[model samples]
Target: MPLSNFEHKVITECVTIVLGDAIQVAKCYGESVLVNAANTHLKHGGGIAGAINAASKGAVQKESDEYILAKGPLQVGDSVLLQGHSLAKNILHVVGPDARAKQDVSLLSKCYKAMNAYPLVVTPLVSAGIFGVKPAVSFDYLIREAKTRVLVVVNSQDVYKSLTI
Candidate 1:
């Protein structure tokens, strides 16, 4: 089947919700920065991080290791930038809270706040997947904290429908 893509303008000019693959949409639209819902250890073993690592041909993991070597592991809400080989010009890896275990909405808000520093960032619903955040909760933080142009990529049809503003 052909890939799907759709966009909806939100309440503010700073945010746009896009229905498609995050990396593909960002790359296709010339968006230079992408956000990865990364782990505290910065391991790209699964989820969006894994997809990014695969797309970058393992460069993401290599850079992540080097980052840890220099700065140690990331804490929740801390974001680190890395070179994006084929994915984008740069990837901003943010550690969001594991909501299923601990519902830290403030930490999740911090993730969006950190990402807001970078303009035109393409990001998924951080913490809304295996991390177990409610889509609505993630969307609320995203809409509230976005200060610059942000493209929220929704890969799941259900999530896309549920999160529409």
Candidate 2:
């Protein structure tokens, strides 16, 4: 499916923001990596994480579990890069701060910064779901941290509205 696109001018250039399914956007854009906001436990139970797990046929979750078993639970702002079975070549799982906890918003920036290391990454609005972050607030950090290489995807109409340029 074709995505609705919005070009928001950043400091140097524009960041392409889209209203669509994250995996579908990744495939459409030929992005090699996809990033999702994950809980510290890396459960992939719901939200964007759930979709990613389903797409990977549970391999992502299995790898996440093994990573936790070996390295312990991911700390807030920490991320793990793992192999992707479908839609993209890799998946980046990031632990974003819970806004309800009054956690530092900078942690969200850290997540975006980390994901920026890869080329052509398709990412959802971190912490903007059950984590309780507002989409506009998430967009602030995303606009600042993400470069031209990143494609921001939002599935909800409310989120899409709030992230307008």
Candidate 3:
């Protein structure tokens, strides 16, 4: 489905506005997360690397997860970074924990506070391979875990399975 077709239960107070692509999204929100497009690159489609290369004509900066976090330990009560560069005031590069690992709303809340970072996650990776849980469970858990709005980016194949936009 086209992004225009999606209707989210947007929280207006917490969420200023919603947008589709980065340019428009950037225009609406001072702080933004670049939820990458699902590209078939990791063998089947053009994956993240391919997207980055395409974005900058192969001149894109490829930073390690550690490198992104190394900018600084994102702190809480920090003024939200607005009008910052594409890199961001702070980017907390993270990989989601497995289903087996314990997850708490409080723990997650604190983590988000400490990092002072927006939680941008790709799923149903939560269950697709890591947790071996169901997609519905994955979605529910994420919805619970999320404080601000959750931006879900799904491939067309995934859309067929989930019937979600």
Candidate 4:
């Protein structure tokens, strides 16, 4: 609970969380960005991306393809922005680099930076599941690049108190 070693100031708030679904996290009247872990193809596979696509009535995936056509491949650290439709005001599709291929940890930071402009953000432990980045490193990056306020959503209840890095 203590963040003496943390670097990013994140306005006046610290990393706090509420056990909730990523698709359900939203704001009352402003932009609440979701950090989607996308690949080069901009397809939404299983995990959080799939959940978002389903909740948005497939709009997420459809807009993703559109984003790709408008802007080339969703490069590592680079992002494609899409209207939330009925979801958040904006959905920042942050591309997750191939951890097994590039083996770059900095890409993780880029993913966070893609949505740094947002006053409030909802993010998960990127690459922790299916994406291939280990838990410890991913958790550290989440703490580092998150700006303003962060609402971390985890799939499991145990993760609420077990975010050790």
Top lDDT: which candidate number?
1
lDDT of 1 at 88: 84
lDDT of each: 0.83, 0.80, 0.33, 0.69
* Off by more than 4 A, model 1: 1-11
* Cα-based lDDT at residue 69, candidate 4: 85
Total backbone clashes of candidate 2, pairs 3 or more residues apart or in separate chains: 0
Residue 124's lDDT within candidate 3 is: 24
Model 4 alpha-carbon miss at residue 5, Å = 30
Deviation in Å, model 1, residue 16 alpha carbon: 1.0
Q: Write the per-residue lDDT of candidate 1 for residues 1-165, one digit (tens) a residue.
A: 112445544656788787778988778655568999998889989999999999888989999998898988988888988887867878999998897778575788889998776767889989988899887788898888889888888888787878763
Model 2's TM-score against the true structure: 0.88
Q: Name the weakest run of 10 consecutive residues (lDDT summed) in model 1.
A: 1-10
Model 4: residue 17 alpha-carbon error in angstroms: 2.7
Task: Please give, for residues 1-165, the per-residue lDDT of candidate 4 as tens digits.
Answer: 222222122323646554556656554325677767677777888788888888889988888888778777756767777778767878777777567775576788877766668887777777777768865677678778766677666666666546621
Q: Any idea what lDDT model 3 has?
A: 0.33
Could you give the candidate ranking by TM-score, starting with the highest? 1, 2, 4, 3
RMSD of each: 2.8, 2.8, 8.3, 5.6
lDDT by residue for model 3 (1-74), tens: 22354343343323212222332332244444543212111111234333433553433333322333555433
The top-ranked prediction according to TM-score is 1
| lDDT, candidate 1, at 76 | 82
